[PDB]
Design a protein around this ligand. Structure first.
Ligand SMILES: C[C@H](CCC(=O)NCCC[N+](C)(C)CCCS(=O)(=O)[O-])[C@H]1CC[C@H]2[C@@H]3[C@H](O)C[C@@H]4C[C@H](O)CC[C@]4(C)[C@H]3C[C@H](O)[C@]12C
Ligand SMILES: CCC[C@@H]1O[C@@H]2C[C@H]3[C@@H]4CCC5=CC(=O)C=C[C@]5(C)[C@H]4[C@@H](O)C[C@]3(C)[C@]2(C(=O)CO)O1
Lengths: 247, 13
């Protein structure tokens, strides 16, 4: 079996938010529901990471490190994909029962949070990203940041990361494809990968603010609260190296 | 401590 076919079979099942559409909407209600959904998506992301070939060979501390650094990148990218596949309209499809439409976008402070996530879906649409490219790109996002002083299994990590870069290359070549157009496409997809650091920076600013300001009464489930608590000191101590394809 | 994450990584599945 090919490497991309193994990434495909471990794709998590779509989760429902359990959002009651008969009750009126509010920004607070949507944010709260999404944090609970995020916690369940993150538990499924751990099971997913464990089945990625090579991931389990890294030191356990590195496995934890990579999931903690990349969690928001993984969530926003998968959301970008679901939004891109559902429609060609400017919609965020968090779950099949929780889609942020134009009427929902008009709720106080909905748009300023949603614009960074809408950028991901609009880019996947503009670049006409394939399912195989997507699968390779999402695994690369798990491998997109490391500690300032590196991982315990740094050498093995670099080898695994290079393998998934070559795997993204193989997905691009399937369309079908011109040598010059291949390098152009590789450049474009890696540029989108790089821009995920900027999308995530913007999303974490809202995430960290709503987690820390207890007077906002915005709840996060245990899975997300634990990751956020771990990550906030790492950002304040500059303990992060954001890997880039383009300098 | 990251109790939940370590548990999910160490448990079977
Ligand atoms: C702080 C964030 C986001 C706003 C923000 O910081 N984004 C602006 C970007 C600035 N740029 C200059 C970059 C442009 C906003 C977005 C939604 C807001 C909550 C809800 O309304 C519901 C509720 C109403 C109460 O009455 C006051 C409390 C509460 C919990 C609100 C608190 C806070 O206010 C939130 C989290
Ligand atoms: C429409 C409100 C957005 C506003 O923007 C912040 C970033 C949010 C996460 C983005 C990725 C994601 C994709 C999913 O499919 C399920 C859940 C999450 C992981 C999102 C949620 O947790 C809420 C979120 C953390 C956020 C917040 O600060 C609320 O406190 O909501």
């Amino acid at each position: 079996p090919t490497l991309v076919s193994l990434l495909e079979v471990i794709e998590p099942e779509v989760l429902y938010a359990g959002y009651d559409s008969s009750v009126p909407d509010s920004t607070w209600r949507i944010m709260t529901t999404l944090n609970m959904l995020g916690g369940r998506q993150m538990i499924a992301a751990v099971k997913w990471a464990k089945a990625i070939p090579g991931f389990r060979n890294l030191h356990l501390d590195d496995q934890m490190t990579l999931l903690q650094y990349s969690w928001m990148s993984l969530m926003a990218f998968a959301l970008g994909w679901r939004s891109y596949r559902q429609s060609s309209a400017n919609l965020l499809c968090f779950a099949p029962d929780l889609i942020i439409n134009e009427q929902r976008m008009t709720l106080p402070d909905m748009y300023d949070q949603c614009k960074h996530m809408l950028y991901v879906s609009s880019e996947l649409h503009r670049l006409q990203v394939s399912y195989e490219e997507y699968l390779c790109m999402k695994t690369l996002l798990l491998l997109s940041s490391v500690p300032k002083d590196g991982l315990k299994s740094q050498e093995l990590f670099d080898e695994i990361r290079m393998t998934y870069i070559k795997e993204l290359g193989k997905a691009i070549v399937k369309r079908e494809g011109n040598s010059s157009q291949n390098w152009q496409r590789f450049y474009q997809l890696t540029k989108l990968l790089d821009s995920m650091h900027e999308v995530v920076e913007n999303l974490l600013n809202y995430c960290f603010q709503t987690f820390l300001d207890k007077t906002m009464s915005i709840e996060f489930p245990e899975m997300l609260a634990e990751i956020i608590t771990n990550q906030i000191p790492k950002y304040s101590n500059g303990n992060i190296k954001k890997l880039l394809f383009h300098q | 401590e990251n109790a939940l994450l370590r548990y999910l990584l160490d448990k079977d599945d």
